[PDB]
């Protein structure tokens, strides 16, 4: 049938694993991290750290961890052109891994156009299609941003709002069917709210530490986490 | 005649069985619990137990209950993305019952976009009318929130509201035609409310009880329902 | 001629019957209950008696009565799913009636579409052209109700307005060239208006008596109707 | 030539014949009551009588009276539904007829549509063209009543103005080219005033009496007319 | 040339002869009454004597006057309906003039539609066209108020405005070319004021007299006209 | 060239030859009245000579004057109709000339619609064409005023402004093209401004004497110029 | 290539040349007055010497001067009708020259239509494109003034500001490609501003003086410059 | 594939050179100066130095400096019109380098229409693809300015936001792909924000100095920069 049982479904669910924020607190409120199977947002300021983060996970998503998680290659389209390979060699310092190894770890993409986005998400497919299992995360930083460019104006969002979603469906159809977490930053019933099963706020609390909360996602608790940035990606905000 | 009798019409109506909510006080307020040959709501807040109830009955229509009703297979449309075989064998257990079960027991199918959930729902169909008495609920959660989206701004509802309607129909038609109980989440003489005969307002009662209460269904009573939900779905609220 | 005179006219209306409402000063207001070749429209609050009058008539139309009214079948058609063929075998009783019959007794046809309402009305006419003098009421509740759906928003009223006439038109057309009493319940110079040649209004008198008074109907009295309601249907209200 | 002289005119105009009202005053006030080779329009209340001088004259027309009028058959269209051959029987009576006669005496025709409306006005010519001298009345209540149905909302007037005079031209071109009388209820430089020569306005002086006076008619008096009502059509207000 | 000389010019205007009003101070507004070549507009009321004027000169424009003025035929196009030959031998009296001459003295057509209006407009040519010199004046009251009729709502003015002066011109051609008078009774830089060369307004002075002015006419005097009516048509006022 | 030299120009320029306005303050402001290869504007109130000016001029561009222009034919375009040959033969009295002369003199040309106008127009061309140097002057009184007609309500100005200038280009390029001197009378950066060179305004100072003042005119003096009004023409305001 | 080098462009900047204002401290402003591969506006009022100034310079672009100025010929397109061959010899005095000469040396052209202007500008290229170094100004007093004509209202200005920029860019285009100096009188991120480089602003310093400011200018002083006008043109205004 | 790994990417940003700004405290803000791979925008006042540091880069990118960065030929394309070379033989030699040379070392291009500047934008790249590693900078001031024009009223504006982001993408594939240093000036979530990788402000500090501040660029310094402007180009700012 065009659907499988739900015993047959949680045999999927199984291979459902977080990949770690590199900070705890922050880890738990997501209990584990990012997940898969789930399109996850990041919501911001002005000047957030989701555009750090995503170098973290570039990362995190390589070293092994709970769950028995392997890690894997990953793809990350960047729309906005803030992608540092010179981060990532800072990172994998704090976590001890070849540098030559971690960057031939990412796979790089610099998103145009809002048409050469999808051009390229319904590209990811094939190489997720080619083989499986070895990509274990897809961040696009950010999505929505570069569409909000070639719209035709305050009346056209009606080619935006249908092409928006005639894609944010082609990338949750990724996540769940090729099992791996997708990421994505950006700062806006909203069609990038159902689009997205989890929903991080961030805010933060003097220049060192950050605030993440959740505006939506299944289990969310009423706590913040409170977190730190550093060269080494994202960590613990300690005392 | 493209209609039948009265009589012959009572005919049918004695195969109206419903399906607990799991909760007294509630099964009370729908005089049995969800209905067949009926569409019926869920209304709630942005933390509402809807989701959880779903769950709840993918299981208590397996369990045999009043008016000798069976138990039978079920399918579970999942626009949202927020089905969790895992809540199951937690409930299959306040009903002692082989995991394995419950799950080979439900069908499980992801609704991406609002051309693709009514592609669902003309096949639900085929697989009612290919053999039957074996389906004894439809449970969509949420119909509308996958429609709110591919709308072309506040400027072509008439796409959608003809659009949502040309299948809330095809909805109707099943359940009475097929005789389930068909059961739906969602957070809206409103299209969707002739459509569905049995409308269902959720409140909560500070975090343990939740309180249940009509919008507008047939011989609707004045009183409210209190219960309560737990890893073994919803039940009873005591003392 | 594409028209007769006034005699071979009356010739007609002395076949002109009434068919009792089951409450004398609510038969009064209507001189005799529900007409002939005339549609009557049930004007009433968010909970109205109109859905169980329905049934009331579904019998009254059988027991013989006043002016030598016979009795005859009946068509239910059913737009809001309210019909309950137990409530009939709960009335025949108080009119001391053959349960299977009153049932054997009645048309029903459910109403999904707006315009499976007029594939039906369309069809009602075929079984009247068929054989004639057995059919004795039309009774469609609600009729409006099913179109304020299928509508296309605010701004296309257009084609309601124009589709809705379309048909109360072919009601009337029905009404008085096939000599029956169309019953019509919904809660709305309005093309129901014209459309109706007697329109009735509800309201509540405390739960168990109703008052019926009339909106604009040909000699319409100034005063009201005190009627009771119960499990037999409709009846008169007592001390 | 596509016109007459003065003279050969004024010949016609020697044909020009008063229907009374049934009341004195109120034949005084048109100088006779109805009037020929003229439209002539009746302005009222909620509840006028309108509805029943139409009966009245479909009688009134047949006593032969002043100005040797002889009297005539009938045409009564009927877009309201309020026709009562019963009443004629009642009246004919006050003027000591033949009752199958005042009725093989009145031509019935009901108007459901805005089209059927002139489907028949294109036809009462032929009738009138046919056989002349016979016809002495088209009585057509109400004219427009029926047309504020079938428009396409306050947005398609003009389809509606259009056809309404589209008719209400060819109504005028049969009462003065057949030569016969035109009455017409309504409620509404307005399309229907050129149209119709002369208009009676209708007020109700409690209960008995009724007030007729002219909106606009050539030779139109400041004075009101006293009239009352009975079974018998309409009369003189006495003592 | 497509144009003459101006001698070759006035050797027209010595044609020019003006139709009395009856009124001699309302002749001397006019400097002799109605003019040639020109199209005279009739300002007024509610109550207005134009349409009673418009048969005065019905005559007038037959009794030989001033400026050695033969007298002649005359065509009265009747918008309205208002055209009563009995008020012409009722004014051929004070002019002593046979009566049967008046009337075939005068041209009568009925305007019904906005088209036949000048359906007529260009058969009056025609007539004119055939021979000369006989036909005097072309009265036609009123000429607008007809086509405020088969307007298309206040949105369509566009076809009227367009349509009136496709014709207010055609009559223009017609009065000076052919050398008639052109009288226009009505209620209105207002395309029917360039249209018309002489615009005259009425007042009433109470019931008697009426004191006619000027809105607009080559060498127009501050004074005013005061005129008197009765049977025998329009006339001087007396002490 | 499509274009000639400033020499070549200035050698036109020799051929600039002003027409009296029969009024020598008058002439002033205009320093020598009408001017040629230039087209004049007459800004006036509801009550101004500009029509009386046309024939003042009608005659004075006959009689030789200053910069020894000789006198010649003309084209008197009228709009209004109001163009008196009579007139004329009561100037050319004030003038000492022959009468059938200065009419002999003028050609005269009704203007009906504002296509008939420029019909006119582009003949107006071949007979300057034709033969040169005889005809002096082209006055078109009024030109705007047609055209407020056939325009389609204030919607399709977008007709008129382009239609207009369609045209007061075509007059352009007669005046300075074939030299001549072009007056005309109207009552409005407005296209019919940069049109005209020079734009005269006109008040009333009490009956007898008229204040002349330019809006618009090169070398335009701050002084006024009274001017007084008789049968012959426009003349000079004494003591 | 399609585009120069640096060097091989100060190669033809080398050929830039100032045309004098006639007025020292103007020519300050300007740095030597009118420049060339450079469009030059003129800002003014009501009654500014713009139009004064076009004939100045129609000569002073013929008096060899600073710079090593030769002096060329001239094409004057005139959109007002404001050019005084007469001006011209009244000029060349204060600069002791030829008349015959001065006006032998400017080409002059009328523009009427907005169609006109550019079928000259288009033109006025082949004559420098024919042969080179002989003209060296292109003035068009007033460029814009004749398209707020042809325009269609306040709604076209889409094919109005589109056509404007169609040519304001061929005329650039010919500026510097041909290297001449163009100079531009009217009275308005404007369009026409990008369009001109150097922007001139006249305001009247009572009768006599001009005070000559800059709107926007590479390198524009903050001071004004204050001159003179006489018959002689434009001069500096002495104590 | 259709996109290169981390690796592989930073293998290329080692290839990431800046070109001095020539003022120390504003080449720190941009760590270096203008970035290659990256469209930079300059925000200013009516008067501001972005058309004078325009040239300043136009030799800087030729003076061998830090992170052994060479220096190039470029590419100027002047919307606006202010390119100086002589400006720029003013700078070489606070440079001390040959004239001819830093000419010869300029490529120029004036933008005359929107569609001329990509005409353009489409070929600097085949120069660019043609030979490597000789263009350093591709400077375009300025990029907008010259779209506000070519539009079609604040109707059209998605003629242009479609047209202008059309292009912007075509310069960051410029960029980024052929690895130069883009420079752009101009006056305005900003289609042209997330377009320019690094926005500079500009205010003016009294006249000498200015500052430059950022708008927002990765790693924005909230310090402001205090420069200089002098004939050679921009420099620091002493005691």
Same sequence: chains 1, 2, 3, 4, 5, 6, 7, 8.
Avoid: W
């Amino acid at each position: 049938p065009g659907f499988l049982t739900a015993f047959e479904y949680s045999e999927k669910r199984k291979m459902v694993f977080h990949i770690t924020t590199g900070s705890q607190e922050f880890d738990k409120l997501l209990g584990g991290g990012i997940e898969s199977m789930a399109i996850t947002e990041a919501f911001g300021e002005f000047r957030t750290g989701k555009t750090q983060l995503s170098h973290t996970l570039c990362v995190t998503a390589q070293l092994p961890g709970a769950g028995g998680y392997p890690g894997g290659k990953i793809i990350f389209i960047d729309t906005e052109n803030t992608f540092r390979p010179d981060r990532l060699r800072d990172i994998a310092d704090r976590f001890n891994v070849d540098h030559d190894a971690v960057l031939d770890n990412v796979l790089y993409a610099r998103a145009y156009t809002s048409e050469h986005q999808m051009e390229l998400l319904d590209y990811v497919a094939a190489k997720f299609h080619e083989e499986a299992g070895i990509f274990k995360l897809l961040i696009i930083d950010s999505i929505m941003a570069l569409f909000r460019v070639d719209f035709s104006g305050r009346g056209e969002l009606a080619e935006r709002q249908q092409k928006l979603a005639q894609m944010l469906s082609r990338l949750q159809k990724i996540s769940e069917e090729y099992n791996v977490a997708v990421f994505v930053t950006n700062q806006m019933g909203h069609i990038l709210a159902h689009a997205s099963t989890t929903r991080i706020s961030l805010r933060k609390g003097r220049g060192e530490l950050r605030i993440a909360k959740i505006y939506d996602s299944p289990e969310m608790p009423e706590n913040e986490a409170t977190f730190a940035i550093t060269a080494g990606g994202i960590g613990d905000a300690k005392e």
